[PDB]
Design a protein around this motif. Sequence first.
Motif, PDB file in Angstrom:
ATOM      1  N   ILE A 136     -22.024  17.826 -19.765  1.00  0.00           N
ATOM      2  CA  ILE A 136     -20.873  18.721 -19.845  1.00  0.00           C
ATOM      3  C   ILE A 136     -19.728  18.064 -20.594  1.00  0.00           C
ATOM      4  O   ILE A 136     -19.153  18.644 -21.518  1.00  0.00           O
ATOM      5  N   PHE A 137     -19.390  16.844 -20.201  1.00  0.00           N
ATOM      6  CA  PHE A 137     -18.336  16.069 -20.840  1.00  0.00           C
ATOM      7  C   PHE A 137     -18.904  15.485 -22.125  1.00  0.00           C
ATOM      8  O   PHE A 137     -19.551  14.436 -22.112  1.00  0.00           O
ATOM      9  N   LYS A 140     -19.111  14.102 -26.228  1.00  0.00           N
ATOM     10  CA  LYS A 140     -18.460  13.010 -26.940  1.00  0.00           C
ATOM     11  C   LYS A 140     -17.191  13.481 -27.632  1.00  0.00           C
ATOM     12  O   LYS A 140     -16.257  12.694 -27.799  1.00  0.00           O
ATOM     13  N   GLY A 141     -17.126  14.757 -28.015  1.00  0.00           N
ATOM     14  CA  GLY A 141     -15.906  15.289 -28.582  1.00  0.00           C
ATOM     15  C   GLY A 141     -14.800  15.453 -27.567  1.00  0.00           C
ATOM     16  O   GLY A 141     -13.623  15.446 -27.941  1.00  0.00           O
ATOM     17  N   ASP A 142     -15.157  15.608 -26.294  1.00  0.00           N
ATOM     18  CA  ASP A 142     -14.155  15.670 -25.243  1.00  0.00           C
ATOM     19  C   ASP A 142     -13.433  14.338 -25.114  1.00  0.00           C
ATOM     20  O   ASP A 142     -12.200  14.288 -25.072  1.00  0.00           O
ATOM     21  N   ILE A 172     -13.112  11.977 -27.248  1.00  0.00           N
ATOM     22  CA  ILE A 172     -12.280  11.692 -28.408  1.00  0.00           C
ATOM     23  C   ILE A 172     -10.942  12.402 -28.284  1.00  0.00           C
ATOM     24  O   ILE A 172      -9.888  11.803 -28.533  1.00  0.00           O
ATOM     25  N   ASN A 173     -10.968  13.677 -27.870  1.00  0.00           N
ATOM     26  CA  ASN A 173      -9.756  14.485 -27.762  1.00  0.00           C
ATOM     27  C   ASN A 173      -8.766  13.896 -26.774  1.00  0.00           C
ATOM     28  O   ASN A 173      -7.552  14.020 -26.964  1.00  0.00           O
ATOM     29  N   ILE A 174      -9.263  13.235 -25.734  1.00  0.00           N
ATOM     30  CA  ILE A 174      -8.383  12.485 -24.852  1.00  0.00           C
ATOM     31  C   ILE A 174      -7.823  11.272 -25.577  1.00  0.00           C
ATOM     32  O   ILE A 174      -6.611  11.042 -25.586  1.00  0.00           O
ATOM     33  N   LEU A 195      -7.586  10.730 -28.714  1.00  0.00           N
ATOM     34  CA  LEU A 195      -6.609  11.192 -29.690  1.00  0.00           C
ATOM     35  C   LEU A 195      -5.257  11.417 -29.040  1.00  0.00           C
ATOM     36  O   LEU A 195      -4.222  11.020 -29.587  1.00  0.00           O
TER      37      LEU A 195
END
Lengths: 48, 53, 49, 53, 13
Positions: free
Chosen positions: E2-3, E5-7, E9-11, E13
């Motif tokens: 669910i979580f 790899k793009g999630d 990164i967004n944190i 970032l």
Amino acid sequence: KLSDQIDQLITETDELKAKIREVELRLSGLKDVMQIDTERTTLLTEAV
Amino acid sequence: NLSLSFAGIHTSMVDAEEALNHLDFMWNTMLTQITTSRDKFDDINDALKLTSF
Amino acid sequence: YPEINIKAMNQAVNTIWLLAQRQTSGIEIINDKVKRISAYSREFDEMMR
Amino acid sequence: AQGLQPQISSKKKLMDDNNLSTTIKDLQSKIDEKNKEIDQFQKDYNKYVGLAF
Amino acid sequence: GIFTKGDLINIKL
């Protein structure tokens, strides 16, 4: 004095006309990002 | 100009909004499953007959 | 196996890379939104081939 | 690596979006504005010197 | 998962 009014006015226009440059430079950059999602759908719905 | 500064900061938080919600829900899933493992494991004692164990 | 038009796709991969460098938002977070999107899509075309 | 093909297309897009066909018209507006003042101040200096004698 | 790899990164970032 009346000529100096127009001297400010021509200065105040192009300073403000420099502002719509940056907005249009931004908005065209943002519409470029808005087209990415349109072609992201054509990429993915084909790849799905 | 400062409105645009917050605009990205707001845009960063919206992506940080969705990301933590999926992060919290996985840990909440894991913290549940560890907890319901431990509490059922407290029934284990030598008086249990072997099928019920 | 109905229909796959990669002429519409490998253009669309290439334009996403094209619009990645082209964009002039002047902000620092779209600048690493698109970079993460576009580096996927280029690697997506490579890894499909 | 940034692509060489879009790096050309980035600059080529910049060469089309330019104010150079506009600012030259804008600067020739101001020169023709300021020439009207100079063509007026010659009338002034040819009048005050007429008055000063 | 669910979580993604793009999630994460967004944190970061």
